[PDB]
Tab-separated table of C-alpha atoms in Angstrom:
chain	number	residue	atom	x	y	z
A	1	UNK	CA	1.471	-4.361	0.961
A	2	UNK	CA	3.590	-1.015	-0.245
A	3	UNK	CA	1.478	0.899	1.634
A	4	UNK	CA	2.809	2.038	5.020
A	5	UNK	CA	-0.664	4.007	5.864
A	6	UNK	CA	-2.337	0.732	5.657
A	7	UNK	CA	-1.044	-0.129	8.989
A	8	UNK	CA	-3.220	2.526	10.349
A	9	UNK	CA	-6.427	1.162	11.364
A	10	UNK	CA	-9.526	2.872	12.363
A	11	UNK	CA	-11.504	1.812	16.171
A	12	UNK	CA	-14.658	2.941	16.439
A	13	UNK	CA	-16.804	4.026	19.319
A	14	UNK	CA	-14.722	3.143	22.229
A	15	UNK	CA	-15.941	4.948	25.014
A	16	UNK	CA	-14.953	8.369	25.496
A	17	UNK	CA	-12.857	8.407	29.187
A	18	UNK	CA	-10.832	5.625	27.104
A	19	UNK	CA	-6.699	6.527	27.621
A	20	UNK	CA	-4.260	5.771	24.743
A	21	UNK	CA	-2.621	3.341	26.948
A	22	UNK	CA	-5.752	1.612	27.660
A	23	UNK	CA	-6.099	1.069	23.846
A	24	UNK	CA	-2.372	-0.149	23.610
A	25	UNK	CA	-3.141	-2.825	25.818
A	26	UNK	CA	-6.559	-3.798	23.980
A	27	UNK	CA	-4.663	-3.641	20.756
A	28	UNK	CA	-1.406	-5.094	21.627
A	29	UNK	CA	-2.962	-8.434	22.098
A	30	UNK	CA	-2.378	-8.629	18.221
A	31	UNK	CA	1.142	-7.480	17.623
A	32	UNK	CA	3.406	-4.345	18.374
A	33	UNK	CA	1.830	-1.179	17.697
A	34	UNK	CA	3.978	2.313	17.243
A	35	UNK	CA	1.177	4.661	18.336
A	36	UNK	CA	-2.376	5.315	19.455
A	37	UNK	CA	-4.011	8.296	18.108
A	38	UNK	CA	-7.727	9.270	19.896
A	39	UNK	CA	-9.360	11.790	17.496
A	40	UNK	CA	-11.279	15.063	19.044
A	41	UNK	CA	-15.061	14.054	18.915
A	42	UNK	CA	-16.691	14.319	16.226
A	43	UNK	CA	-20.002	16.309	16.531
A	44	UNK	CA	-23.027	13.585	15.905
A	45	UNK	CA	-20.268	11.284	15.376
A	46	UNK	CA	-18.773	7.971	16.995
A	47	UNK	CA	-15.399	8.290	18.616
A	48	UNK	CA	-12.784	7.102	17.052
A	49	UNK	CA	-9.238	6.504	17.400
A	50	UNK	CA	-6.274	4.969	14.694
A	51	UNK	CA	-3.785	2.302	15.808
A	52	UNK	CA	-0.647	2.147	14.371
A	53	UNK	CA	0.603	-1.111	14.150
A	54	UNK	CA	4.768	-1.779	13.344
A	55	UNK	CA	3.766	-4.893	10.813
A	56	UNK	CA	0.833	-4.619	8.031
A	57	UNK	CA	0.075	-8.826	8.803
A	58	UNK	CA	-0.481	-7.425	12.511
A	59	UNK	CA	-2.882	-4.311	11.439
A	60	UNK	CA	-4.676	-6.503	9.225
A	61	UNK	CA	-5.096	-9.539	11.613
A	62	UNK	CA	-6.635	-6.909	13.975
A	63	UNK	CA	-9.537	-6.096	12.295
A	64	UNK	CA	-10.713	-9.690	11.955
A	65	UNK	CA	-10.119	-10.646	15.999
A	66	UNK	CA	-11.303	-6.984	17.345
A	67	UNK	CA	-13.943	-6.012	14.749
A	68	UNK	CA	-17.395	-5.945	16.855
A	69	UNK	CA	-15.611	-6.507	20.152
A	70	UNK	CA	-16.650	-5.895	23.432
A	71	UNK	CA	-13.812	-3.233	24.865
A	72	UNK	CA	-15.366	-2.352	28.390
A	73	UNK	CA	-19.275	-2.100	28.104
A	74	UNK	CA	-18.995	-0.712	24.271
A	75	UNK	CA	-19.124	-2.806	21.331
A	76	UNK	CA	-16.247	-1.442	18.835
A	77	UNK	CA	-15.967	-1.492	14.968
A	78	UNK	CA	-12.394	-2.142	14.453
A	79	UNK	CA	-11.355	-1.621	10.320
A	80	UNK	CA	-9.184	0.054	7.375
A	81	UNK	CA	-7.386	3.356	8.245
């Protein structure tokens, strides 16, 4: 799509001693990614983090292969920016 922002996605509750680079690898499995952001915690609020993937048909593809995904010992909700 037009959209560049698209290719944002949001990951839900990973756990919180999670490292960008640790996410880069989890999320790289789908396609090339141009940067992890990890959010400051939200106060009675999951974590959550936004990938940046380089293609939209990558960002996309990720949220149907890592949605409700086991990363670690956390299940993660992985969708739209």
């Amino acid at each position: 799509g037009p959209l560049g922002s698209m290719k944002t996605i949001l990951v839900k509750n990973l756990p919180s001693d999670t490292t960008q680079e640790e996410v880069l690898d989890y999320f790289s499995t789908i396609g090339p990614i141009k940067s992890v952001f990890i959010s400051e915690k939200q106060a009675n609020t999951p974590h959550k983090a936004f990938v940046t993937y380089k293609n939209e048909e990558e960002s996309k593809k990720a949220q149907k292969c890592l949605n409700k995904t086991i990363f670690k010992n956390h299940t993660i909700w992985v969708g739209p920016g």
